[PDB]
Amino acid sequence: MTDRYSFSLTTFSPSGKLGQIDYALTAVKQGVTSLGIKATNGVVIATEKKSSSPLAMSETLSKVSLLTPDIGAVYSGMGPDYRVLVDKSRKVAHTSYKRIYGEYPPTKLLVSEVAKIMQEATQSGGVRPFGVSLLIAGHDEFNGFSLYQVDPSGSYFPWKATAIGKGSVAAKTFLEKRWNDELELEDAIHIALLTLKESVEGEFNGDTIELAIIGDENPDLLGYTGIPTDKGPRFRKLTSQEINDRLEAL
Template sequence: MADRYSFSLTTFSPTGKLVQIEYALNAVNQGVTALGIKATNGIVLATEKKSSSPLIDPPSLSKVSLITPNIGMVYSGMGPDYRVLVDKARKVSHTNYKRIYNEYPPTRILVQDVARVMQEATQSGGVRPYGVSLLVAGWDEGIEPDVEADNVSGGAGAEEPKPSGKTGGILKGGPMLYQVDPSGSYYPWKATAIGKSATSAKTFLEKRYTEGLELEDAVHIALLTLKETIEGEMNGETVEIGIIGPPAHHLMGVEGVEGAQGPRFRKLSPQEIEDYLTNFGVLEAAIREGSAAASTALAGRKR
């Protein structure tokens, strides 16, 4: 009886579960750990680059992908399934949405489209669920709510301006972090982890995460979390990090274009990761001992 429901791709078991989704989650839980941390001024995506052979060229291994200039993605699970979803996400962003609106989609809209593709695979005949979970990070520019004219009177006793109702103050900008599961479910997170050591990584993040976290602090907390889960040496070749941060104008490829800004998402080079790891011992002790010491250490690194 159980085998019948295990074999069927779209039939619910008597307990109300789609067994193939459970199997897809097992594939995710066997993958390497990946995590995301949202800061006040950006987001960090970090994962382990695990090679099955020392003969593989390390630069060819990549788990963090650029979708749009302001959106990036990392996964845990089956690599081939991930490549298909990356292609679909890029197609939605660069052709479908941009062709209509002349801009890239907000993070939430892109996540909804990817989640819809993953959900359709759970109820369509002849296909199986995607064996990956995704962490999608992006920066939305947002739309400032219009202000009623009679509210802008100025003066010391003037009331705070109120939204006009045209936007309702709903479309806010800033960093956004989402997790998408094989079932097509998606959730916004402040910090989360997926993969083999997701449970222990989440426990670690719950202890270390604080409101008002800066991007530099988030990078070091990500490295601390990976250190708890990685077996072996951490270096620029075994760790991959992508960040959402200030516009990187040097990556535009052109200069002198009025109003243009560089991408907010970029991957750290192996040398940049090595630089973080060089000061890792001091910063690890500082973060563990207290935020004041950590701030002092980070301030020294920024200089």
Template sequence: MGDSQYSFSLTTFSPSGKLVQIEHALTAVGSGQTSLGIKVIPVIAAANGVVIATEKKLPSILVDETSVQKIQILTPNIGVVYSGMGPDSRVLVRKSRKQAEQYQRLYKEPIPVTQLVRETAAVMQEFTQSGGVRPFGVSLLVAGYDDKGPQLYQVDPSGSYFSWKASAMGKNVSNAKAFLEKRYTDDMELDDAVHTAILTLKEGVLTPAEIEDYLQEVE
């Protein structure tokens, strides 16, 4: 028996130990536009931070590009980029902003990056075990800065999350991660990280003209 007969059951494990609906959610992420992040903490005294980049393709030239936002601000010190289904990401962004606001009101200080990631991941995990819902078809790269310095986390539809020095998701993720592994160094500075992020997108995604437009937009 294969796993296909379990694909319509959200909470039943297949004989191979998988929740097949999560596999479908990861497929949705893999078909989404490429996004990546690079954390920068130079060994020597220099500017640090997190660089996030993504491909932004419009479904039609008639779409107003200002209405399509791949990178969202959760708090003044935390941002997020997604790959996968845009509507799912908006739900998670709204829930994350609400959680951050509740923390701010209660403790009178910004929510730590790790805690906001944990709360968001918990919401995603709940949607893998509840009736009447489905897993979120989106993965998130959460970039932020707090008392522990720059932070970069990837959160997947299963609710699993890890801290990364650099990571990528979406289309061509294998090539993108392989390229990042070759280019990433612990003494990388912000300018190098921006350059590496653009080259990573160029590796399998952007044309030279699109890269030129991206650089002009950044400047």
């Protein structure tokens, strides 16, 4: 018994490709479209909620996840792989940062830790790479707002705006025409909804769309008062009703 697979399952082919990473990216291509847009005073991340059955309650399945009060994540590819990555990402923000410095990590460094975890699944013994690409949006005092993409290889890139998954090629082109460096958060939400409608086929409402922002601090979502320096989470998940309000003036 015991894990006898102590050797790498991802290796270089004669042409120089890392097969399993390429094949993982192929799994991401099949995945449902998700996107992110960076505004001057915030960031928006959005995706379609592909329901497996109409008897399924799609509210119980969250594709957009809070990692820290100021950082959120969305993905394209394999859902289960994403779920465990969110668990590991939430924990590493504490173990390797908050428990040391008494504050949450800046976006770039949390992203760096998730990337490390994904890189190790590319080299360690007896494992396949993760079959997901992540988009991580966040804010921190010294870097302001930022948006990152993390791929199965472990590579990450900062973006003004981007899309991943099914119809990413068309969605990226759409975002290039609309994005400028003066976009206000509400303008970015509007463009996010426009871009997503192109890739969505069936119903397009607040129950089939999942969307969250990184913006102003929300004191009403903190849960307590009395500490002036604690002002609340910048991450907020838009409600089903809040999405439909913006779909009328579309």
